[PDB]
């Protein structure tokens, strides 16, 4: 289902991997670094940090695993607290 | 065109403001775009975008067109934005060829873009009321005469007017009025029998509706080119030849267009008949002048026929090429010296030439002529053909000959002039903003005098103005003023070179 | 009394934007201008020269000598870049393919592209779609380049724009005067007949008059790119905010800090181990000084062009030490570690 | 004479002073002749013809001056006048002269006249930005800025 | 360092990273490959997107938009090497929320 | 004295979780904006009230509780025409150094606008006679850090008569 | 002008103790004295 | 020195594969961690001398090159260690600094090499 | 062989050539006068749209006395598309 989701059978080779992925960092780290980097610099293609490869490179928690959801602390509070009324206005 | 965009940005910021100059720069950089994507990319409110577009289309700086699905696309004209720097020259030439009435007319047409005849004559009367005195009053007859005289001479032209919507598909109106232009009424003036007297600004139904006029920059450009070639031929041969060519250009103004390789055939007889009577020159002397101008090594004029006595024609493209060559050699002489100018003229006359041949024909010792060649090549004034002996193009086994490309040289010179004017405007604004505190101090100490000038004017407020701390700083104010004046004069002077280069560039364009 | 300034924010990086810097921005980023082709001074205690390579104002590489720009040790200094001015521009080996592509896109006379207004608006509307991906951008670039190369006559000014190809190594040539088997044109004849002086003073011009097309040196292509209208820049599939076409041809070199170039003072002898990039930059500065001396002394144009090509290939090796069209006569002696070699590999 | 010798390639040293003096004297002579032709005012054709000066005439004038010791041939004065043309200050015309006091070219003779330049110096050369050698590095905000320009300051203080 | 005689530590190769990814241990991988290996603190300016030092941007000549950021040192070296190659990675920062 | 809407990110350490969040938030905001001046806003005094308080996130890093809090805080910023009552905490020959009562010593009125009887001879002479009123004219702001105050403003002293004090 | 000597002593890098069995001193033609110690465990 | 007490008795002691500076009085460290070059990069980097990173060794005339090569072959035919070659070329470069020595005949350079 | 320079070139290298003095006469004086008059008179025109002032402090009694009142030109909507009506 991964190799046949774009309507065309794409291989695990660098060609199909570049056709299915968008992250410039992992495409450069895989193979053909200089050409891909110079092409991305020419196009100015901004690369996000959604992929796990750039999460490991940039040093941020990856989206997969435990980093998919977020946690909230159950602190004693009151949402929208009472507001002090305005006297002059 | 980064320098052009920067110059347009500075001019728009100086002339119209900040919220509109951003939209103008966006239109220049991104080309034609609908209003929605313009507001999206600029990131400002929609009302400000609408106001900017309207104030830009008022001065005929931008235009709008229709496309599929009835969408409107707004496109800016960078050339039109660049031409508005030449407004003082337009006002000067319309004040020289006409009276001050035409001066004020063209001034109002440039400061407003689109107006009606009644509006412009009313504004001219209101502005001239304070110029004259002695209780008398002016009428609209002389102003209308000056307007129609400007019209027949093609200096002013009717703006493109929307056709009759009642006759053109009466019903659901399109999003854009689809303004069109007709050559018939391009210079026609409808009769305005109404007259009046301008008010002196005491501060105490439109028959010409739908007809808007604007200054025809094409006529001004043609007149400036004529003046330039007249000054050139005057500095070359004599003032008499300059008068002859001025008369022939005045005759050719109407019968020719703005872009043509040559003018219409003009015979010596009609030129002699149309020549001013102030010169006691005979027909034979005129024939001698024409036949010596035809033998000029500049080839400004040409025979191009023998019928009708002395038949002659002028070369517009060749004259503009000669003017561009003169400008280029002058700037080379002023930037690198007389010897480098000699080397440049040598390498320009000969199509291709070698270093040893350059030194032989220019008579300049070694270690200096090659240095001048390298300095001129590093500034994109010359090009090397590099005829190779082998397809490998190895430097050791190939020739090198210098060649001057006038087109690329003129383009880079125009870019340099644009960046120079941009830098001058930036320096002027910097000197203005760095002394804004002294400017406000001077403004307040002079407004203390401007107030109570006549009513309640006591003499006790005259010996304390110079007593302030601004007195030792008046020298700085004078220096700022003279610097601003010199910068403005330099910009206006470079404007003529910009016009010459732009004319030389445009004349060789076919638009095919 | 005290202005409120934020101390620390939990900032995180959202996305990385790639691009290039103009020579002005590249000068602004750097701190000092290294002009000396030497590393250390003449004194015996191995003191580095000021305003030269390995200067401590661009970071530090030794645990004892701190950085001059920032008063911190090696474990705290981040390094500082430098800018090197070149007498003659050189083609960027990384963007050389992009330079050839842009030259095929735009005209050589009016600086405009070979695209009709209808197809211009079509490609504009096709690119205006949101969410344009890398593959879609490359496909659109390929399609527009093919449609532009299909035509040969300039739609803007009308000048002939023949094929353009890479001859030799790091040299581009535009074949404006192509061989025409059918009836010839007047322009090519007027061009060929303008070599009367070369033919008179050199007979070899006659057999070699053909295939004498327009070799585009860095100066001419840079002057052409400096006059590109900004409206045609988005049509070149390059982002205008990321960079400009004139930035493809480099006039300055970014010498990296000492953090990328470690120096190992080997006290067993009188020597300091430096990386290959330092030697490449030293050779570049030496070539700049040599070509400046030749320009001052007025040498032949052959030697000037040879030095220019040598500087170009040395800069290419400094960027990518391994190329394809490297001639065997000017081939490197020993294998060096260029930036590409330091990036890729096991 | 090409490989060795020459009036200017004396002792393998270029003689710039001699050629400069010759150019100046020839320009002065041509300017005086053109001034006399202009002040004559008898007829434009005769004015033009008298403004022209032959290579033989200016060569005999230089010989009458006798500044340089080495003999100046006809081709030497021809090259001097060609350099003057390349300077943009004079004009040459080849007329059909079968035989006369020149006899240099078969059936032709070159006449030279002093001519004024086409146009005065442009406005660009009247600004420091047009003659700056580091004009390429001009940026709004940076080390080389028009605000803190030294060229503009010196030019405004003049 | 690499060698044992050079007091070198163990290397988390590609397969170890693959196993840690398969387990989904995001924080463990972050601590191993970033915090305990090449952790460093740099300064990034939110306006130009370049790298600064000591909370100062030499490019913009200002320090208002400069903010500190944790990063692997190898990533900073890669960014510097790419900037040397005229390939400028413009880092657009944002709030953690 | 005017209210300002401020949206700030507050980090509360986990060892304060026993405290009420609506109190710790106010305490931290008061400790963060005490005797400080917001650029182009003015000198903030203290937190007035808290309007909106969204969820309290916990980041995978420090682990403390991060909250984006919307609140209204009081700042001191005249409207270029407000009349204030300050006390003379010094005087210089070029201008009197009058400080608002226990609030801030930032008001330096220039001695160049009242009737021509103004002269300070360094002997603490306020004004040559013919609880001091002050008329603000223009605000001014600037930065502080420029290498690896900001609110003074001018003061107007028109012909207010001053029947109680010369 | 006076020679300045900095110390570069050879250190025993070993987790466990070692015993020296023999120390050999030799002199080559380069006047460089070579000292070898045979650590025994 | 000690930042708190001011004691200057800081001693370098080898930890468990870690180098650091610590005071013997309060046991507080002032600087921990040391950066050393790796042999993987050491074999890659090329050594540069101040005899070459100053512009020298290029102002070596053909005659000076002949003289130093003569020194080399003379010390090699005698089967001398490389230390003798280094000392001899150093003495030659030191003696060649005089103006009267550099301006001499080939016999003079040869007898100078011999001496 | 080129010698080593111990100081980088100055930021403003000197050139023996100087800009030509500006042209003088009544023409350039009228140029300066007209350009200054245009720069002055064009700012108060309704076409010069200044930035709308914001964060208004308060409303005062003298506002109507200091209210910036200027005649507003009405663009011809017959020539302008309908997408610009406020
Ligand atoms: S420094 Fe000044 S004069 Fe020189 S190019 Fe820049 S703006 Fe023009
Ligand atoms: Zn540093
Ligand atoms: Zn073209
Ligand atoms: Zn910045
Ligand atoms: Zn202690």
UniProtKB/Swiss-Prot annotation, chain A:
Assembly, per entry: Component of the RNA polymerase III (Pol III) (Pol III) complex consisting of 17 subunits: a ten-subunit catalytic core composed of POLR3A/RPC1, POLR3B/RPC2, POLR1C/RPAC1, POLR1D/RPAC2, POLR3K/RPC10, POLR2E/RPABC1, POLR2F/RPABC2, POLR2H/RPABC3, POLR2K/RPABC4 and POLR2L/RPABC5; a mobile stalk composed of two subunits POLR3H/RPC8 and CRCP/RPC9, protruding from the core and functioning primarily in transcription initiation; and additional subunits homologous to general transcription factors of the RNA polymerase II machinery, POLR3C/RPC3-POLR3F/RPC6-POLR3G/RPC7 heterotrimer required for transcription initiation and POLR3D/RPC4-POLR3E/RPC5 heterodimer involved in both transcription initiation and termination.
> Tissue range of expression?
Expressed in the brain, in the cortex and the white matter (at protein level).
Q: Which organism is it from?
A: Homo sapiens (Human)
Q: Which gene encodes it?
A: POLR3A
Top-rank taxon of the source lineage equals Eukaryota
Interval of the full protein contained in this chain: 1292 to 1380 of 1390
The entry marks the following residues as binding DNA template strand, namely: 14, 32
Please state where this protein is localized: Nucleus; Cytoplasm, Cytosol
State the family named in the UniProt similarity comment for this chain: Belongs to the RNA polymerase beta' chain family.
Q: What is this protein called?
A: DNA-directed RNA polymerase III subunit RPC1
Swiss-Prot record, chain F:
Instruction: Tell me one GO biological process term.
Output: nucleobase-containing compound metabolic process
- Provide the GO MF annotations for this entry: DNA binding; DNA-directed RNA polymerase activity
Q: Where in the cell is it found?
A: Nucleus
The protein's matches in Gene3D superfamilies, at most eight in alphabetical order, are given as: Nucleic acid-binding proteins, RNA polymerase Rpb7-like, N-terminal domain
Q: What is stated as this protein's family in its record? A: Belongs to the eukaryotic RPB7/RPC8 RNA polymerase subunit family.
What PANTHER family does the record tag this protein with? DNA-DIRECTED RNA POLYMERASE II, III (PTHR12709), DNA-DIRECTED RNA POLYMERASE III SUBUNIT RPC8 (PTHR12709:SF1)
Kindly provide the name given to this protein in its UniProt entry: DNA-directed RNA polymerase III subunit RPC8
Swiss-Prot record, chain G:
Q: What's the name of the protein? A: DNA-directed RNA polymerase III subunit RPC2
Q: What does the UniProt function comment say about this protein?
A: Catalytic core component of RNA polymerase III (Pol III), a DNA-dependent RNA polymerase which synthesizes small non-coding RNAs using the four ribonucleoside triphosphates as substrates. Synthesizes 5S rRNA, snRNAs, tRNAs and miRNAs from at least 500 distinct genomic loci. Pol III-mediated transcription cycle proceeds through transcription initiation, transcription elongation and transcription termination stages. During transcription initiation, Pol III is recruited to DNA promoters type I, II or III with the help of general transcription factors and other specific initiation factors.
User: Where does this polypeptide localize?
Assistant: Nucleus; Cytoplasm, Cytosol
Spell out the disulfide connections. none
Indicate the disease this protein is implicated in: Leukodystrophy, hypomyelinating, 8, with or without oligodontia and/or hypogonadotropic hypogonadism: An autosomal recessive neurodegenerative disorder characterized by early childhood onset of cerebellar ataxia and mild intellectual disabilities associated with diffuse hypomyelination apparent on brain MRI. Variable features include oligodontia and/or hypogonadotropic hypogonadism.
Part of the full-length chain shown: 847 to 887 of 1133
List the transmembrane segments.
Answer: none
The record's family statement is: Belongs to the RNA polymerase beta chain family.
Organism of origin: Homo sapiens (Human)
UniProtKB/Swiss-Prot annotation, chain H:
Its induction note reads:
Down-regulated by epigallocatechin gallate (EGCG) treatment.
**Where, by residue number, does Zn(2+) bind?**
2, 5, 23, 26
User: Which stretch is the leader sequence?
Assistant: none
Localization terms from the record = Nucleus
Task: Write out the ranges of the annotated region (Interaction with target DNA).
Answer: 103-109
Give residue ranges of zinc fingers (TFIIB-type): 1-31
What family, per the record? Answer: Belongs to the TFIIB family.
Task: Write out the function statement from the record.
Answer: General activator of RNA polymerase III transcription. Factor exclusively required for RNA polymerase III transcription of genes with promoter elements upstream of the initiation sites. Contributes to the regulation of gene expression; functions as activator in the absence of oxidative stress. Down-regulates expression of target genes in response to oxidative stress. Overexpression protects cells against apoptosis in response to oxidative stress.
- State the oligomer form and interacting partners: Component of TFIIIB complexes. The TFIIIB complex has two activities, alpha and beta. The TFIIIB-alpha activity complex is composed of TBP, BDP1, and a complex containing both BRF2 and at least four stably associated proteins; this complex inhibits the transcription by pol III via its phosphorylation by CK2; YY1 facilitates the TFIIIB-alpha complex formation. Interacts with TBP; this interaction promotes recruitment of BRF2 to TATA box-containing promoters.
- What is this protein identified as? Transcription factor IIIB 50 kDa subunit
Task: Tell me what organism the protein belongs to.
Answer: Homo sapiens (Human)
Q: Which residues of the full protein are shown?
A: 6 to 120 of 419
